[PDB]
Design an enzyme around this catalytic site. Structure first.
Site, mmCIF file in Angstrom:
data_model
loop_
_atom_site.group_PDB
_atom_site.id
_atom_site.type_symbol
_atom_site.label_atom_id
_atom_site.label_comp_id
_atom_site.label_asym_id
_atom_site.label_seq_id
_atom_site.Cartn_x
_atom_site.Cartn_y
_atom_site.Cartn_z
ATOM 1 N N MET A 80 6.914 11.642 1.786
ATOM 2 C CA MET A 80 7.929 10.819 1.155
ATOM 3 C C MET A 80 7.145 9.606 0.696
ATOM 4 O O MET A 80 7.208 8.551 1.331
ATOM 5 C CB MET A 80 8.981 10.358 2.160
ATOM 6 C CG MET A 80 9.965 9.377 1.558
ATOM 7 S SD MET A 80 10.924 8.462 2.798
ATOM 8 C CE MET A 80 12.191 9.627 3.154
ATOM 9 N N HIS A 113 5.958 6.225 -0.431
ATOM 10 C CA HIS A 113 6.674 4.953 -0.519
ATOM 11 C C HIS A 113 5.765 3.744 -0.298
ATOM 12 O O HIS A 113 4.681 3.860 0.284
ATOM 13 C CB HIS A 113 7.826 4.911 0.502
ATOM 14 C CG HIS A 113 7.374 5.025 1.928
ATOM 15 N ND1 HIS A 113 6.964 6.217 2.490
ATOM 16 C CD2 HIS A 113 7.216 4.085 2.889
ATOM 17 C CE1 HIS A 113 6.572 6.005 3.733
ATOM 18 N NE2 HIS A 113 6.714 4.720 4.001
ATOM 19 N N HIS A 120 0.846 -1.179 0.000
ATOM 20 C CA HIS A 120 0.000 0.000 0.000
ATOM 21 C C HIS A 120 0.877 1.223 0.000
ATOM 22 O O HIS A 120 2.064 1.150 0.314
ATOM 23 C CB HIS A 120 -0.884 0.017 1.254
ATOM 24 C CG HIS A 120 -0.105 0.154 2.530
ATOM 25 N ND1 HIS A 120 0.537 -0.911 3.128
ATOM 26 C CD2 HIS A 120 0.214 1.247 3.272
ATOM 27 C CE1 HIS A 120 1.218 -0.481 4.178
ATOM 28 N NE2 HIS A 120 1.042 0.823 4.286
ATOM 29 N N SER A 122 6.070 0.273 1.490
ATOM 30 C CA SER A 122 6.902 -0.528 2.376
ATOM 31 C C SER A 122 6.930 -1.995 1.939
ATOM 32 O O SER A 122 5.896 -2.560 1.567
ATOM 33 C CB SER A 122 6.362 -0.413 3.798
ATOM 34 O OG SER A 122 6.476 0.929 4.212
ATOM 35 N N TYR A 132 8.696 -4.663 7.343
ATOM 36 C CA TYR A 132 8.662 -3.908 8.587
ATOM 37 C C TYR A 132 9.522 -4.749 9.498
ATOM 38 O O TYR A 132 9.228 -5.918 9.711
ATOM 39 C CB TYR A 132 7.265 -3.859 9.159
ATOM 40 C CG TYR A 132 6.302 -2.988 8.433
ATOM 41 C CD1 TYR A 132 4.947 -3.247 8.514
ATOM 42 C CD2 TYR A 132 6.723 -1.882 7.714
ATOM 43 C CE1 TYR A 132 4.024 -2.438 7.899
ATOM 44 C CE2 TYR A 132 5.801 -1.049 7.087
ATOM 45 C CZ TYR A 132 4.455 -1.342 7.186
ATOM 46 O OH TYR A 132 3.492 -0.568 6.576
ATOM 47 N N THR A 185 0.592 4.848 1.683
ATOM 48 C CA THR A 185 -0.165 5.667 2.612
ATOM 49 C C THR A 185 -0.310 7.067 2.071
ATOM 50 O O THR A 185 0.651 7.653 1.574
ATOM 51 C CB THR A 185 0.533 5.694 3.979
ATOM 52 O OG1 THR A 185 0.553 4.354 4.490
ATOM 53 C CG2 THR A 185 -0.200 6.607 4.972
#
EC number: 3.1.4.37
Length: 181
Positions: A117, A119, A42, A121, A124, A44
């Site tokens: 920014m 991005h 995803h 991911s 994690y 954000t």
């Protein structure tokens, strides 16, 4: 007073059917080598303050209607300094990507945060610099054509997220909406 429960919501732009499995493939591969929680690809675009379910629903519908499907382009695989920014795909700051973020933050009445920014991911985790540098290389190893890769964000997901919960157990998708071309 009617609705008394309020939560923080995250708003996510989701990859199209075409690119999603490429991303999941890589995420599953990296988290199986560096151990981390499973989560969907995803991008954000906003994190709200406390909202009742009804308020979040309304903000979501407004965002969904006033945002057209757009695309993002991978610049490179980058690494961060904490759990949620471990190994991620840094996205080109194009007008459409930056504006989607701007407009979603407008709709959910978000407060000033840090520079956007954009991005996606990939992992994690809490790794050492070496382990981090290794996971980055591995991303490429697993998918050497990530740089320059463009993908379509054609849906938004409304998610209840304890932005600090590292288990991702409190992370729940409430609603999903299709963005118009």
């Amino acid at each position: 007073m009617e609705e008394v429960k309020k939560d923080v919501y995250s708003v996510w732009a989701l990859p199209d059917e075409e690119s999603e499995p490429r991303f999941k493939k890589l995420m599953e591969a990296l988290r199986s080598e560096f151990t981390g929680p499973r989560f969907v690809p995803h991008v954000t675009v906003a994190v709200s303050a406390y909202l009742t379910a009804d308020e979040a629903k309304k903000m979501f519908e407004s965002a969904c209607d006033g945002l057209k499907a757009y695309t993002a382009t991978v610049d490179r695989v980058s690494t961060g300094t904490f759990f949620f920014q471990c190994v991620f795909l840094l996205l080109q700051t194009t007008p459409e990507v930056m504006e989607a973020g701007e407009h979603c933050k407008n709709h959910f009445n978000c407060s000033t945060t840090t520079p956007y920014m954009p991005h996606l991911s990939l992992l994690y985790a809490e790794l050492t610099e070496e382990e981090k540098k290794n996971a980055q290389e591995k991303a490429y190893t697993l998918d050497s054509s990530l740089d320059g890769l463009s993908f379509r964000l054609n849906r938004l997901a409304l998610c209840k997220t304890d932005t600090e919960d590292k288990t991702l157990e409190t992370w729940e998708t409430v609603a999903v909406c299709n963005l118009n071309p």
